[PDB]
Amino acid sequence: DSCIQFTRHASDVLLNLNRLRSRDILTDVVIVVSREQFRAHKTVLMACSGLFYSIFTDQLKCNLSVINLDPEINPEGFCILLDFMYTSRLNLREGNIMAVMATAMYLQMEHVVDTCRKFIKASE
Amino acid sequence: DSCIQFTRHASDVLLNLNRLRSRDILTDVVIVVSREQFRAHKTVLMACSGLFYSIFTDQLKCNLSVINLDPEINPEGFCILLDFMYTSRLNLREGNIMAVMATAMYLQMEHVVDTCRKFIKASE
Protein backbone atom coordinates (compact mmCIF):
# COMPACT_ATOMS: atom_id res chain seq x y z
CA ASP A 1 0.00 0.00 0.00
CA SER A 2 0.89 3.76 0.24
CA CYS A 3 0.60 3.93 4.11
CA ILE A 4 2.80 6.15 6.35
CA GLN A 5 3.99 4.63 9.66
CA PHE A 6 4.38 6.13 13.16
CA THR A 7 7.72 4.63 14.39
CA ARG A 8 6.92 4.90 18.17
CA HIS A 9 3.28 3.60 17.92
CA ALA A 10 3.93 -0.04 18.98
CA SER A 11 6.13 1.06 21.95
CA ASP A 12 3.51 3.69 23.05
CA VAL A 13 0.75 1.01 22.88
CA LEU A 14 2.80 -1.41 25.03
CA LEU A 15 3.65 1.41 27.53
CA ASN A 16 -0.10 2.20 27.85
CA LEU A 17 -0.97 -1.54 28.26
CA ASN A 18 1.61 -1.68 31.09
CA ARG A 19 0.02 1.47 32.71
CA LEU A 20 -3.37 -0.33 32.62
CA ARG A 21 -1.73 -3.41 34.24
CA SER A 22 -0.15 -1.19 37.00
CA ARG A 23 -3.56 0.40 37.78
CA ASP A 24 -5.34 -3.02 37.50
CA ILE A 25 -7.57 -1.67 34.70
CA LEU A 26 -9.45 -4.22 32.54
CA THR A 27 -7.20 -7.12 33.74
CA ASP A 28 -9.25 -10.28 33.07
CA VAL A 29 -7.20 -13.14 34.50
CA VAL A 30 -5.13 -14.15 37.55
CA ILE A 31 -2.05 -16.35 36.95
CA VAL A 32 -1.32 -18.43 40.09
CA VAL A 33 2.35 -19.47 40.59
CA SER A 34 3.32 -21.41 43.78
CA ARG A 35 0.55 -19.40 45.71
CA GLU A 36 1.74 -16.04 44.22
CA GLN A 37 -0.92 -14.28 42.15
CA PHE A 38 -0.36 -12.10 39.07
CA ARG A 39 -3.14 -10.10 37.39
CA ALA A 40 -2.82 -9.56 33.61
CA HIS A 41 -4.64 -9.10 30.29
CA LYS A 42 -5.29 -12.40 28.44
CA THR A 43 -4.55 -10.75 25.05
CA VAL A 44 -1.10 -9.49 26.10
CA LEU A 45 -0.22 -12.94 27.58
CA MET A 46 -1.33 -14.61 24.29
CA ALA A 47 0.67 -12.06 22.19
CA CYS A 48 3.87 -12.96 24.17
CA SER A 49 3.60 -16.66 24.98
CA GLY A 50 2.90 -19.81 22.94
CA LEU A 51 1.55 -21.46 26.12
CA PHE A 52 -0.98 -18.65 26.87
CA TYR A 53 -1.91 -18.49 23.17
CA SER A 54 -2.83 -22.24 23.30
CA ILE A 55 -4.65 -21.85 26.69
CA PHE A 56 -6.85 -18.90 25.77
CA THR A 57 -7.73 -20.20 22.25
CA ASP A 58 -9.11 -23.34 23.95
CA GLN A 59 -12.95 -23.19 23.91
CA LEU A 60 -13.23 -24.13 27.66
CA LYS A 61 -10.13 -22.41 29.08
CA CYS A 62 -10.71 -19.08 27.22
CA ASN A 63 -13.48 -18.47 29.84
CA LEU A 64 -11.40 -19.13 32.98
CA SER A 65 -10.51 -16.16 35.25
CA VAL A 66 -7.82 -18.19 37.12
CA ILE A 67 -4.94 -20.19 35.54
CA ASN A 68 -2.68 -22.34 37.74
CA LEU A 69 0.85 -22.87 36.48
CA ASP A 70 2.89 -26.06 37.00
CA PRO A 71 4.22 -26.16 40.64
CA GLU A 72 7.84 -26.37 39.36
CA ILE A 73 7.48 -22.76 38.06
CA ASN A 74 9.29 -20.17 40.17
CA PRO A 75 7.22 -17.00 40.99
CA GLU A 76 10.25 -14.67 40.57
CA GLY A 77 11.01 -16.15 37.10
CA PHE A 78 7.36 -15.63 36.16
CA CYS A 79 7.33 -12.04 37.51
CA ILE A 80 10.50 -11.15 35.45
CA LEU A 81 8.87 -12.60 32.30
CA LEU A 82 5.50 -10.89 32.93
CA ASP A 83 7.44 -7.57 33.26
CA PHE A 84 9.24 -8.37 29.95
CA MET A 85 5.90 -9.06 28.21
CA TYR A 86 4.61 -5.59 29.14
CA THR A 87 7.89 -3.61 28.68
CA SER A 88 10.34 -5.45 26.26
CA ARG A 89 12.85 -5.24 29.22
CA LEU A 90 14.29 -8.44 30.67
CA ASN A 91 15.90 -8.30 34.15
CA LEU A 92 18.38 -11.13 33.46
CA ARG A 93 20.93 -11.77 36.26
CA GLU A 94 23.38 -14.56 37.24
CA GLY A 95 21.09 -15.35 40.22
CA ASN A 96 17.90 -15.72 38.17
CA ILE A 97 18.98 -16.89 34.65
CA MET A 98 18.24 -20.60 35.30
CA ALA A 99 14.69 -19.90 36.66
CA VAL A 100 14.04 -17.34 33.87
CA MET A 101 15.13 -19.78 31.08
CA ALA A 102 13.07 -22.68 32.60
CA THR A 103 9.99 -20.38 32.85
CA ALA A 104 10.50 -19.04 29.26
CA MET A 105 10.74 -22.66 27.95
CA TYR A 106 7.45 -23.58 29.73
CA LEU A 107 5.73 -20.33 28.55
CA GLN A 108 7.11 -20.85 24.98
CA MET A 109 8.83 -17.43 24.70
CA GLU A 110 11.47 -18.36 22.07
CA HIS A 111 13.42 -15.07 21.96
CA VAL A 112 13.88 -15.11 25.78
CA VAL A 113 15.00 -18.80 25.67
CA ASP A 114 17.53 -17.77 22.92
CA THR A 115 19.20 -14.91 24.92
CA CYS A 116 19.30 -17.12 28.11
CA ARG A 117 21.04 -19.93 26.15
CA LYS A 118 23.62 -17.41 24.77
CA PHE A 119 24.25 -15.74 28.20
CA ILE A 120 24.73 -19.21 29.82
CA LYS A 121 27.13 -20.31 26.98
CA ALA A 122 29.26 -17.13 27.50
CA SER A 123 29.79 -18.02 31.24
CA GLU A 124 30.95 -21.66 30.57
CA ASP B 1 18.15 -1.12 36.25
CA SER B 2 20.52 -3.57 34.42
CA CYS B 3 17.79 -4.96 32.02
CA ILE B 4 18.45 -6.02 28.39
CA GLN B 5 15.78 -5.10 25.80
CA PHE B 6 14.36 -7.01 22.80
CA THR B 7 14.07 -4.28 20.08
CA ARG B 8 11.26 -6.01 18.07
CA HIS B 9 9.12 -7.03 21.14
CA ALA B 10 6.57 -4.15 21.00
CA SER B 11 6.08 -4.57 17.20
CA ASP B 12 5.69 -8.41 17.57
CA VAL B 13 3.10 -7.88 20.35
CA LEU B 14 1.08 -5.44 18.18
CA LEU B 15 1.32 -7.83 15.15
CA ASN B 16 -0.06 -10.67 17.34
CA LEU B 17 -2.86 -8.41 18.72
CA ASN B 18 -3.81 -7.61 15.09
CA ARG B 19 -3.82 -11.41 14.25
CA LEU B 20 -6.24 -11.95 17.18
CA ARG B 21 -8.44 -9.09 15.83
CA SER B 22 -8.41 -10.66 12.29
CA ARG B 23 -9.50 -14.06 13.70
CA ASP B 24 -12.04 -12.37 16.09
CA ILE B 25 -10.26 -13.91 19.11
CA LEU B 26 -11.03 -12.42 22.56
CA THR B 27 -12.56 -9.23 21.02
CA ASP B 28 -14.79 -7.79 23.78
CA VAL B 29 -16.55 -4.81 22.20
CA VAL B 30 -18.37 -3.71 19.03
CA ILE B 31 -17.90 -0.08 17.89
CA VAL B 32 -20.96 1.06 15.90
CA VAL B 33 -20.34 3.83 13.30
CA SER B 34 -23.26 4.98 11.06
CA ARG B 35 -24.64 1.31 11.16
CA GLU B 36 -21.16 -0.18 10.36
CA GLN B 37 -19.85 -2.48 13.09
CA PHE B 38 -16.20 -2.97 14.12
CA ARG B 39 -15.08 -5.64 16.61
CA ALA B 40 -12.00 -4.81 18.73
CA HIS B 41 -10.19 -5.28 22.06
CA LYS B 42 -11.08 -2.59 24.66
CA THR B 43 -7.45 -2.49 25.92
CA VAL B 44 -5.98 -1.77 22.46
CA LEU B 45 -8.62 0.98 21.84
CA MET B 46 -7.75 2.54 25.26
CA ALA B 47 -3.97 2.32 24.53
CA CYS B 48 -4.49 4.29 21.25
CA SER B 49 -7.30 6.76 21.93
CA GLY B 50 -7.99 9.35 24.65
CA LEU B 51 -11.73 8.95 23.95
CA PHE B 52 -11.72 5.13 24.44
CA TYR B 53 -9.45 5.51 27.48
CA SER B 54 -12.09 7.83 29.09
CA ILE B 55 -15.01 5.53 28.02
CA PHE B 56 -13.62 2.26 29.33
CA THR B 57 -12.29 3.75 32.62
CA ASP B 58 -15.87 4.89 33.35
CA GLN B 59 -17.40 2.58 36.01
CA LEU B 60 -20.67 2.09 34.00
CA LYS B 61 -19.35 2.15 30.42
CA CYS B 62 -16.39 -0.23 31.11
CA ASN B 63 -19.06 -3.02 31.15
CA LEU B 64 -20.73 -2.20 27.81
CA SER B 65 -20.23 -4.61 24.86
CA VAL B 66 -21.54 -2.03 22.32
CA ILE B 67 -20.35 1.61 21.92
CA ASN B 68 -22.15 3.94 19.49
CA LEU B 69 -20.07 6.74 18.01
CA ASP B 70 -21.39 10.21 17.14
CA PRO B 71 -23.41 10.04 13.84
CA GLU B 72 -21.09 12.63 12.21
CA ILE B 73 -18.26 10.01 12.31
CA ASN B 74 -17.46 8.47 8.93
CA PRO B 75 -17.11 4.61 8.95
CA GLU B 76 -14.18 4.68 6.46
CA GLY B 77 -12.28 7.23 8.63
CA PHE B 78 -12.89 5.00 11.65
CA CYS B 79 -11.79 1.84 9.77
CA ILE B 80 -8.48 3.55 8.67
CA LEU B 81 -7.81 4.61 12.29
CA LEU B 82 -8.71 1.19 13.75
CA ASP B 83 -6.21 -0.35 11.25
CA PHE B 84 -3.59 2.23 12.39
CA MET B 85 -4.20 1.33 16.07
CA TYR B 86 -3.40 -2.34 15.38
CA THR B 87 -0.55 -1.85 12.84
CA SER B 88 1.14 1.65 13.25
CA ARG B 89 0.27 2.10 9.49
CA LEU B 90 -1.97 4.98 8.42
CA ASN B 91 -3.62 4.82 4.97
CA LEU B 92 -3.70 8.62 4.48
CA ARG B 93 -4.92 9.79 1.04
CA GLU B 94 -6.16 13.07 -0.54
CA GLY B 95 -9.68 11.53 -0.69
CA ASN B 96 -9.83 10.55 2.99
CA ILE B 97 -7.58 13.06 4.89
CA MET B 98 -10.48 15.31 6.02
CA ALA B 99 -12.55 12.34 7.41
CA VAL B 100 -9.41 10.79 8.98
CA MET B 101 -8.40 14.07 10.74
CA ALA B 102 -12.01 14.69 11.99
CA THR B 103 -12.19 11.09 13.33
CA ALA B 104 -8.69 11.35 14.96
CA MET B 105 -9.75 14.64 16.67
CA TYR B 106 -12.93 12.97 18.05
CA LEU B 107 -10.99 9.81 19.12
CA GLN B 108 -8.20 12.00 20.66
CA MET B 109 -5.30 10.43 18.69
CA GLU B 110 -2.87 13.40 18.85
CA HIS B 111 -0.07 12.02 16.63
CA VAL B 112 -2.56 11.25 13.80
CA VAL B 113 -4.12 14.76 14.13
CA ASP B 114 -0.53 16.19 13.89
CA THR B 115 0.44 14.39 10.61
CA CYS B 116 -3.01 15.25 9.05
CA ARG B 117 -2.52 18.96 9.91
CA LYS B 118 1.00 18.89 8.32
CA PHE B 119 -0.16 17.01 5.15
CA ILE B 120 -3.07 19.50 4.72
CA LYS B 121 -0.70 22.52 5.22
CA ALA B 122 1.67 21.15 2.50
CA SER B 123 -1.21 21.09 -0.08
CA GLU B 124 -2.34 24.74 0.57
Binding site: C3, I4, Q5, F6, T7 | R89, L90, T115
Partner: peptide, 4 residues
Protein backbone atom coordinates in the same frame (compact mmCIF):
# COMPACT_ATOMS: atom_id res chain seq x y z
CA UNK C 1 6.28 9.39 10.71
CA UNK C 2 8.14 7.43 7.97
CA UNK C 3 7.63 5.66 4.64
CA UNK C 4 7.70 1.98 5.85
Amino acid sequence: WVIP
